[PDB]
Amino acid sequence: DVHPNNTQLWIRYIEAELKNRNINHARNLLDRAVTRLPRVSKLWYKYVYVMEMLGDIPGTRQVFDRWMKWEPDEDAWNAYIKLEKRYGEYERARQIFA
Amino acid sequence: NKAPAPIQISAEQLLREAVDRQQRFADLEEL
């Protein structure tokens, strides 16, 4: 409430939620964080990294789909292509190149 | 003995002696 757009406070609060194994709380928190600051790639990168660490590959894919809806820089597109290339899935990477 | 001293004092000497001369709880109530 005092610091709404502070990325460091968001990162530390998501991390503090995650280190106590509150997964659903932290996923709600990451949704709030990427809603408030959609142009901070640090929050998106943490969000895809967390939902790749916990298995959950379609969830990581839909988070990447939201990120690609926001039209990010080339690094996020390359990260999405690397995600889909890692687990086979080359044709969907072809639509990502499109 | 008014001859010059072999170790002449400098300002950084004064700085060197300037620098050097500067739980468990039994119960839940005190917790």
């Binding site: 106590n20 509150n22 997964i23 659903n24 709380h25 | 739980q23 468990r24 709880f25 917790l31």
Partner: peptide
């Protein structure tokens, strides 16, 4: 997770918190 945090709050022991 709310219930689990309530359980962890109700069973906290300040014995192993002294060591880092």
């Amino acid at each position: 997770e709310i219930a689990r945090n309530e359980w962890q709050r109700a069973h906290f022991d300040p014995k192993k918190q002294q060591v880092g």
